[PDB]
Amino acid sequence: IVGGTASVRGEWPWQVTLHTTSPTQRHLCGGSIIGNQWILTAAHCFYGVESPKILRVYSGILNQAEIAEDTSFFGVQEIIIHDQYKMAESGYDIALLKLETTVNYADSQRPISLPSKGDRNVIYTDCWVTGWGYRKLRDKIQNTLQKAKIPLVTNEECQKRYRGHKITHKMICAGYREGGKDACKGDSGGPLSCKHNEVWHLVGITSWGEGCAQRERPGVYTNVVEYVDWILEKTQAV
Predict the structure, then answer these.
(1) Catalytically annotated residue among 32, 188, 193, 207
(2) In the annotation, is 44 catalytic?
(3) How far is residue 13's CA from residue 2's CA, in Å, rounded to a whole number?
(4) CA-to-CA distance for 171 and 165, rounded, in angstroms?
């Protein structure tokens, strides 16, 4: 996260840090708890990932330093990538991680509500992007979970900033005309959470952007509300 500040422990209880154990353990991407056995994240986070066996999901974390070899984690039983996903910039950058065990909810780890189709008309004015991503294009994974308040921008306005791309209604952007605050490498898969009527909703999933926090370059996120049907269908037992 560029231009953000340290989060308060437990402030974003749905935020998880997804690690890969190959070659050695390290933070890979962010993600959000949306169900007792489900993490919603970005599909592009699994590039080069052949098996769920090398993944570890850690919940209730503020500082990466809290994670040691003796720290408990959730194994991943299955990685579900949207069948239409090709690459972040083309959309459909969404994936589900089915955990091997269920998360026991507590003040430090609980699910975030998904947006309702009836809220697509609602204008969010209190949105935050969080993560352990870079603090600057050329940086490294941060120890403390960072947060930054960023205003949503209309898709028409976003399209104007990315003339070489197609900003679809399945995407949502957030940023300052002057830049300065934005997600960055390592924040991918994490949430764009907006508080509306005292209730937090998972509005977007950190996906991509031209560099990080640049002027006239809003961050691009997966528009979660456009995938509630997909999420329901994929998270059904059988």
Answers:
(1) 188
(2) yes
(3) 21
(4) 12
What method was applied to determine this entry?
X-ray
Residues in the chain: 238
Which two tokens mark 54? 């090398």
Residues in binding site for heparin = 160-163
- Indicate the residue type of 106: A
Resolution of this structure in Å:
1.7
Our answer to whether residue 70 is catalytic in this structure is: no
Token look-up 């974390």 returns: 61
Q: Answer yes or no: 116 catalytic.
A: no
Domains in the chain and their CATH numbers? 1-12+112-226 (2.40.10.10), 13-111+227-238 (2.40.10.10)
In contact, 74 and 56? CB cutoff 8 Å: yes
Q: Where are the alpha helices (DSSP H) in the chain?
A: 155-161, 228-234
In sequence order, what are the residues at sequence separation of 6 or more whose Cβ sits closer than 8 angstroms to the Cβ of residue 174? 127, 129, 150, 151, 152, 153, 192, 204, 218, 219, 221
Q: How many CB atoms sit inside 10 A of residue 75's CB?
A: 13
